[model samples]
Target: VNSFSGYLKLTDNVYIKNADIVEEAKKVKPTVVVNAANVYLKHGGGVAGALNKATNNAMQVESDDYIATNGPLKVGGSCVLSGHNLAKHCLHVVGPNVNKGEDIQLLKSAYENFNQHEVLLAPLLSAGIFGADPIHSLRVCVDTVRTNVYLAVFDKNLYDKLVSSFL
Candidate 1:
């Protein structure tokens, strides 16, 4: 089982719950995609927690530009947008901050990621992470990821579907 924080034993068959999705996803390396929206709009890692503990916990009292091994993309941004650097390629999209509508940025970002041959990383935030679900955010993640990704996950069942779909 893939394990982290010594919290849960992630069997090849079990889906993770309340764990650091980014780090776990990175470990498995299946084109990690998060559905976060406004996560870490100014910082790295959202409420989902930090992928690299050292970096996340490190004290940076001043807003100084620090260099992350990942470079460029490490600067503060949304998780959906920032997570892209973690993958061979990533697509980060921010849906409307208010009631949902066609997210042009999201669509454009996904297209760009696909065209750039990068993996897509989505994180549901505006879609409801810490309690913020705009009307249009509905299934935004599913639709966006499904456009290029052969697999998509909305629940444990969907995650399983992804595994099988890819396999």
Candidate 2:
């Protein structure tokens, strides 16, 4: 595994981190990995995009099926997808749009869905394109998950900011 800094412990198993998310995902091989997506099931950029690409767009296809039957996935709603490269399963959740105001409740609901897994992998949920505060979203992840939570970060600037502010 790659080296990371300021491993802020939220609990005995949960931790916030700064490292390559893809590498961390492979190393940890989480039972379920969470991705922030839109209600339309588009995984165009950010973590969702990466995961969709890695899985050969299988996640997207599954997400389409889910939305087709269930209708547009609302904020805080989630669906599970079969994993591909790293994780054994993928949890797709609808987070707040950047244009929309902060939706901490939705983000928390997404993280809460992963509680059944022993090891869960997540990014700064909705922080990039969605414009939610990384620290605040991360807190929700820690608050919701009782199992091991690996908070992976790819951006060095984001890493620094999170370390300085919360570590």
Candidate 3:
């Protein structure tokens, strides 16, 4: 694993890191760690899986309960649950599944909704298996986040590129 890069100040509140959200959230103690989640709230792999494991699967069970009670969240919708271990609470947002022809706005909507929560392990939503464009995802995050955001960029090359944006 790459060494965690501490907060690189973007401004008064916004921050970025070259690290893993789940790992950094453990050390940072964010108010709510945002999960890059599916509409069904499944925490099977990727960031969701790490969150699930960190919480000892409590996060996954809570997700299951939330879905069982109110059904699957819509694209750009979010559900809150106990953090169990790291963050005070976990906020799950379903980014647009771009593979299904969902537009970028749905992805941005997810970022916009994150304002309701506090500090976060910001997600580059929909950019992985969901197929959203990388540049677009990064822009949405940089554009929408207004609070104490600790944006995580795991890839070294992307981190170097993104860090250069403001250096």
Candidate 4:
């Protein structure tokens, strides 16, 4: 385990973390692991890419099925699939493109939409390849999600920053 492991209470249930997201997911074995992706179901980069590889590409197949049935996955909308390698379930959400200066509203809505489960493991949505500010994106997730949230932090600097913000 990382020495930086700690928690910040965002709400009665929701909590932020300073640990590896995937490792925490494995330890907690949450009901779902949310993957931030685009409407195209492209899991070739960022956490989505890592998860896709971790699941032996099962995430991609499930995401493809979701798109086939539901059309393009709308921003703030989500789909769930049986977990293959990590958790028991995989929750997929369409994240905003920060390069386009996406609104925090939609990002918050995306976080809010994931209320189907009790425990969930997720990264800072849109903070990676999407180019969103990590701290801002994390705030939106913590502010909006209503369940038990275990947010993973891969960077030591980010971990310190998040903890400092809460303090």
Error of 4 at 38 (Å): 1.2
lDDT of 4 by residue, 23-61 (tens): 776666677888887877788877788878877887788
The ten-residue window of minimal lDDT in model 4 covers: 1-10
Residue 25, model 2: Cα distance from true site in angstroms = 2.8
Q: Which residue runs does candidate 1 get wrong by more than 4 Å?
A: 1-20, 30-41, 44-49, 52-86, 89-92, 99-118, 129-138, 142-146, 150-167
Best by TM-score: 3
TM-score of each: 0.38, 0.82, 0.88, 0.86
- Compare candidates 2 and 4 on TM-score and give the better one: 4
**Candidate 3 lDDT tens digits, 1-167:** 12335768876656777787877878766778888898899999988898899889888888898889899988888988887877788888888887888777888788887888656667668876788866667677778777666778677777777667656
Cα miss at 50, model 1 (Å)? 2.8
The residue pairs in collision within model 2 are none
Q: Return the clash pairs for model 4, or none.
A: none
| lDDT comparison, 1 vs 2, better candidate | 2
Write model 2 residue lDDT over 50-157, tens digit each, in one string.
878877887788878877898887787777777677678877777776557746667777677677677667777778778887878767766777877778788778
The CA lDDT of each predicted structure is 0.34, 0.73, 0.78, 0.75
Task: Write candidate 1's Cα lDDT for 1-167 as tens digits.
Answer: 12223222222222223334565455544454543333222334452334333235322211122223233332113222233334432233233443433443453343233323233333433433333332233233343332333222235653443344434
lDDT of 1 at 30: 41
Candidate with the larger TM-score of 1 and 2: 2
Scored against the true structure, residue 145 in model 3 reaches a CA lDDT of: 70
Candidate closest to the true structure, highest lDDT: 3
As a TM-score, model 2 comes out at 0.82
